[PDB]
Amino acid sequence: KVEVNLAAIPLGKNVVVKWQGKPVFIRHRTPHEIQEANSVDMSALKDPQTDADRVKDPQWLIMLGICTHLGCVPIGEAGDFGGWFCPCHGSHYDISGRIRKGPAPLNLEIPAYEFDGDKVIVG
Amino acid sequence: MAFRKSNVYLSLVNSYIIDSPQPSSINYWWNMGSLLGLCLVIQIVTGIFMAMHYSSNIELAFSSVEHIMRDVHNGYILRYLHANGASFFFMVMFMHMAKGLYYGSYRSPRVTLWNVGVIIFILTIATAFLGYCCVYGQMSHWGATVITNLFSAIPFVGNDIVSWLWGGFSVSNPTIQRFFALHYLVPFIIAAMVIMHLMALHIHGSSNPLGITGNLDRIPMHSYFIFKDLVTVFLFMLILALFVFYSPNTLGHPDNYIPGNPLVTPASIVPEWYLLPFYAILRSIPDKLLGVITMFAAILVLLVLPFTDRSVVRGNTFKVLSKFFFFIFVFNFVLLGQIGACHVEVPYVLMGQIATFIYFAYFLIIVPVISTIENVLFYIGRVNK
Amino acid sequence: WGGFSVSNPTIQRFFALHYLVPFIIAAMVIMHLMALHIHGSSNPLGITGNLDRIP
Amino acid sequence: MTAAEHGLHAPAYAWSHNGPFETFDHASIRRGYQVYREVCAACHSLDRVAWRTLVGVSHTNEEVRNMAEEFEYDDEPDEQGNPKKRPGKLSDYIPGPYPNEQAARAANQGALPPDLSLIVKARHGGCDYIFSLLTGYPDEPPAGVALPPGSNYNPYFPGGSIAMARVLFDDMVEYEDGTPATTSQMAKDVTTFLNWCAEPEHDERKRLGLKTVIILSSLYLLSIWVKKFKWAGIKTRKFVFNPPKPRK
Amino acid sequence: WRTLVGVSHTNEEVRNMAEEFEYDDEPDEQGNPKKRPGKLSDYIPGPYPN
Amino acid sequence: PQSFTSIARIGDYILKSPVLSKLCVPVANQFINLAGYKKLGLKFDDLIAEENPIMQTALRRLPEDESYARAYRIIRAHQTELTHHLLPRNEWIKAQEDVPYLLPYILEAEAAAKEKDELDNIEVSK
Amino acid sequence: GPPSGKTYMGWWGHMGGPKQKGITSYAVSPYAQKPLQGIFHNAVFNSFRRFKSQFLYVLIPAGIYWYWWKNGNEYNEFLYSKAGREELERVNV
Amino acid sequence: GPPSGKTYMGWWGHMGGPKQKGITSYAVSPYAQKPLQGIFHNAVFNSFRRFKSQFLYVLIPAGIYWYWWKNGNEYNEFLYSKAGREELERVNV
Amino acid sequence: SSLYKTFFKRNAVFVGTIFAGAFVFQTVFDTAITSWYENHNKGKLWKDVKARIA
Ligand SMILES: CCCCCCCCCCC(=O)OC[C@H](COP(=O)(O)OC[C@H](O)COP(=O)(O)OC[C@@H](COC(=O)CC)OC(=O)CCC)OC(=O)CCCCCCCC
Ligand SMILES: CCCCCCCCCCCCCCCCCC(=O)OC[C@H](COP(=O)(O)OCCN)OC(=O)CCCCCCCCCCCCC
Ligand code: HEM
């Protein structure tokens, strides 16, 4: 388990840390895209959740990439909405991390990060 | 008596390779078991001399194989003989098993001889998997990732077996260091099962291509089958030397010359040619737990074959319909290897599902049905009622 | 040595030979028990034991 | 998949080391190192190759000593414990242009150029793929293709979009022996030099294979003759049956 | 540092002892070196560089 | 190992039916000629596998002049195969010589073994 | 040592077949024969006789599995070309 | 299998000794006997009888080699002390 | 023929003449192949390129 602080995150990036030997994608979430993350209808997806059950974080955004296809990886935020266009089979998706554009029906495990008193522990 | 018959150690040599009574009419298909003992000696000797220069750490494994190819005197000969000698070990073993299918060698009284040979086949597949991961190329990392994640689908003990098999949270430094120590050991367990294989052969002897008794006409082993063994030994070494010296990278993948990277996925993940038919059986079941059971049941279905053969005659020499369906099973095994090297696409998904059905229906449906039909055709073609 | 003194090639080849020789000892133990089987054991009196045996 | 996602198939050129009795052309390995030093080495490392392996293959012992002494290497520290530097010797390896891979991506717009020590064995196609890539940049992409900014079109690359621009142009290198340095001439010389970097045993392996095949094919023909001699009594054996009288 | 927790000091005490030393980090995005304070998985440092 | 009692039970039902005999018997005649054991000088009862106690009983009870003739046909077939030839056409087994000489000894050894099993696993009916 | 279970093979002198009577055999030394007198007629006439007896049990199953692979390979090439784009969308649902 | 060379041991029934005639033996079941009735007299009287019969073959060679080591150890301690310095120079030439 | 009767006179060779002729075979076989291999590749070897820069 790695331990990072609040403002010590790499904010304007998509840093692929090898935490636990696993690729993981990290993004600073500005509070302006609560209007903009969920304008996508999740009925164009195959299974919906919410933003709430997925992202329990107001201003940070983490999801890992041990993919069930074979374990692919995307390219940083170009493409369609601010999401992540992937060069393996042509997948790209929303700013939050839920796939429908391209053949990937499921979605990934979110890491069990945890907050306790000006700390967050990815693990 | 002679000294070779009275000495305790020379009597075992005399009773196996000198004075052993052999059937007179066995052909060159009975020479494959002698070639398999030569293949096992080449793999053990070339591997011990390469192990004096090898480092099994995760940041030293790929560069020590490159050190063998460049700095060790005749080190490229040691590696190419070892990498191509593993493909020749599997080609002769496929021909040895198919000889027993055609001539009815699995039948009684040789059922214990057939069951020990199935154990040898499972241990050889495991050995070639463990040594391929010790190169730590790009094909070695993602082939170990696919196979070890299959055991996470077992109920209630999935996540405990896979973490104990990794030594951590992924394929890492403890995975490669324990895969090399297990790769040194399992060839010595195969050598102990080969001795138990020859002990079961000694009490009944060999069969013959006619399927009838051989106790009426025997010749000894020395100077007939010693010099008939030499013909296929020199042909084996000549074809193997043409691959080692003139085309040493035909039976491999180019992606295994890239160092392994856990953050970059290759475009295609394909095994070696001798694991391709069992890889297409695994990808044909959409469920994840049912695919692992079906891939291991493709080897264990050879054990049901003494019970589903309902014929009173041993072998396929005088059987018309059994000869036709034997070669359907053979070319279905080649199509399963070609499907396992393609992409998951239309129409290769349906073609691999029908071919997986024909693999299992041969042992369980086709063989007991046409054995019974041939028993009745032999009867009513002679009896006049 | 593999070189001019006791160095890195000396230790890497000493470990590979250390893995192998215990398996050669195990094959000589089987040949040891085969020679024992044809005559049996002796006894502390030094005389024949074919008159009184137990399994 | 689509043919654009596979890449175009590379044709078969007549390399002079193709064939079971052929060696490398060592005047083309020497010409190919000069195209490496003046063109390729700005962004590519050659990390598996030592300086000493070039002596007797493409340069003399006096030439390689002067090439190695133009670079600086780390020495053992001082008596006070301070670091030091030293020129190169024959047991060193050829150095690369970047200190780490973070600095390599920063100079190439995020892309990482690979190590070229094994690039011939690590691509499907071999020498024919490397030659077709360097000479296969079109002057314009075909109509309809949308390239990202910072990418170039090459039909032999899988996907058609590569992060390397066209580098080879006519008469950018002045050869020592007087060969005209066109685009196709310089692309042929690097591919011969890079095949030697991946397989430095190639000339010796094909000579030991000539001795092994002659001996093993003579032993195969002699063993067929010996087997037919020792089996001649069994193969012409004859059997007669006279049924016994029913006394019994 | 982690082997001292539960033997002679608490978890809160060893975290403050490790954070008084400086360790090498992964390099920058430009490729420049960096430094960082210590954590529990580090080893106790020595006084001399060589 | 089906049974020789089960083979004769199915085969006698076919030969007594008038419409099943016209359809299955010409197929059985081409099946035997394509087998090719008569070109090696063998009968069908030489081909039965013999490493079972039922077959060892039937070979003991065979008369002595037929056991001598059977041993010669097996030895002659092993020599013909290792030379990779066939016999001359005047030494092929004809259709009226391919008789089941061993079948009546097999059927009486099997009926005695079945009767011993039904008496060793019998239930009283008080 | 003790004896073990019964077998179906013996050794020289007690091999375990039926009793033989009435068969006589003849042979001639290999040193008295002319060397390699089957290099011509066995290689042409006899190997042709062994080939064509067993070639329909092998080439009829081989032609079935080669026709099947060739049509599946040609249909996959049509689906990923430009002309086969609206058939690709409906066989992927 | 074939037979091998002759031995001096057999198996149960044909072990290979002389013929026996005239000897009779008697035994009693272990379930009919009182447990551990040799824990006292065997441990004191009988083990003392076995000890003192064989103790002079062991302790006379043991006392020779212990007297030899003890004088060589005490002479080496004298040679490297202060009083044994002029003897050390003449036994080292 | 008769030239395999002049040297041996109805016998086998012997075990020592096999080992003696095997070492004489190795030095003549190695020299004859290295001469044919370097003549087949003349002009491409390093000893031919080294002369043309001098
Ligand atoms: C991985 C590489 C391994 C290399 C070693 C393996 C080689 C063994 C190949 C498999 C095999 O055993 O098949 C043999 C089979 C013939 O068996 P048979 O006893 O009925 O024929 C005795 C012969 O007439 C007289 O044989 P004879 O003793 O007179 O001459 C010896 C012959 C050499 O033969 C061999 O070494 C085995 C091929 O010399 C010549 O051919 C002269 C020309 C130079 O052949 C056939 O039935 C069909 C032929 C093709 C089968 C290949 C299938 C592989 C997929
Ligand atoms: C886990 C399960 C593993 C199972 C592995 C299955 C794949 C095995 C691959 C090898 C298959 C080769 C078959 C070997 C079986 C040998 C027995 C046999 O078939 O007998 C030879 C056959 C009939 O022999 P007869 O005794 O009747 O007379 C011969 C007179 N010429 O006479 C013949 O017809 C000649 C035989 C020629 C066979 C050629 C077909 C095989 C081609 C394989 C190609 C594979 C690479 C693409
Ligand atoms: C039944 C015997 C064996 C089989 C089938 C086998 C198989 C293999 C295979 C397929 C590889 C990968 C080759 C490559 O692609 O480079 C390999 C690698 C290797 N094997 Fe074996 N092996 C056997 C016995 C042994 C033994 C007994 C040892 C050591 C004492 C050994 C040592 C090695 C080593 C060091 C490698 C490292 C990679 C390399 O050098 O190619 N092998 N083995």
Ligand code: HEM
């Ligand atoms: C890998 C090491 C193996 C060795 C060294 C070996 C060795 C041998 C040898 C020397 C023979 C007798 C000669 C012959 O019939 O060719 C034989 C026969 C046999 N083997 Fe193997 N074998 C191996 C693997 C296998 C496998 C994988 C199987 C089956 C799944 C098998 C099953 C049999 C059978 C059934 C026979 C008897 C065939 C007959 O008598 O007609 N063996 N083996």
Ligand code: HEM
């Ligand atoms: C790993 C090494 C060895 C093993 C497993 C082993 C095992 C055995 C066993 C089980 C016996 C059976 C009877 C008994 O326990 O006395 C025996 C007897 C014997 N062993 Fe060993 N032994 C080993 C080493 C040796 C050595 C180093 C020697 C002599 C230099 C030796 C010489 C003998 C002799 C002479 C006997 C017969 C003694 C008698 O019957 O009175 N063995 N051994």
Ligand code: HEM
């Ligand atoms: C004659 C000169 C050169 C040769 C032979 C050469 C060779 C190669 C090769 C073989 C590749 C890999 C292609 C593949 O993976 O399929 C490559 C990629 C690359 N090269 Fe070069 N190179 C040369 C010069 C240069 C130069 C001058 C640059 C300057 C920026 C450069 C930058 C790159 C980059 C960024 C890549 C990665 C492309 C990608 O992954 O999309 N190369 N080069």
Ligand SMILES: COc1c(O)c(C)c(C/C=C(\C)CC/C=C(\C)CC/C=C(\C)CC/C=C(\C)CC/C=C(\C)CCC=C(C)C)c(O)c1OC
């Ligand atoms: C039916 O007819 C047959 C029949 O035809 C045959 C051939 C056989 C013969 C059997 C075989 C050919 C199979 C036997 C093969 C094995 C048992 C394989 C075992 C392999 C080994 C024991 C390999 C051991 C190798 C080493 C220990 C390597 C040593 C390397 C060293 C010491 C390197 C260090 C060197 C230095 C200088 C430090 C039969 O038994 C038989 O049945 C009657």
Ligand SMILES: CCCCCCCCCCCCCCC(=O)OCCCOP(=O)(O)OC[C@@H](O)COP(=O)(O)OCCCOC(C)=O
């Ligand atoms: C005039 C003569 C000239 C002839 C020259 C011809 C020489 C040709 C040699 C090469 C030909 C084949 C090469 C293979 C070879 O040599 O193999 C060596 C012996 C074969 O194995 P084996 O030891 O006989 O069997 C070995 C196994 O079958 C026997 O099992 P085991 O465990 O040993 O049983 C006893 C168990 C004891 O166990 C215990 C607990 O004590």
Ligand SMILES: Cc1cccc(-n2nnn(C)c2=O)c1COc1ccn(-c2ccc(Cl)cc2)n1
């Ligand atoms: C998936 C993939 C990709 C690349 C390489 C390799 N691989 N691994 N080793 N070699 C030589 C390779 O080609 C693989 C493994 O492919 C298979 C197929 C079935 N098994 C298998 C079955 C039973 C057991 Cl016990 C162990 C393994 N493995």
Ligand code: FES
């Ligand atoms: S990664 Fe699942 S479709 Fe691209």
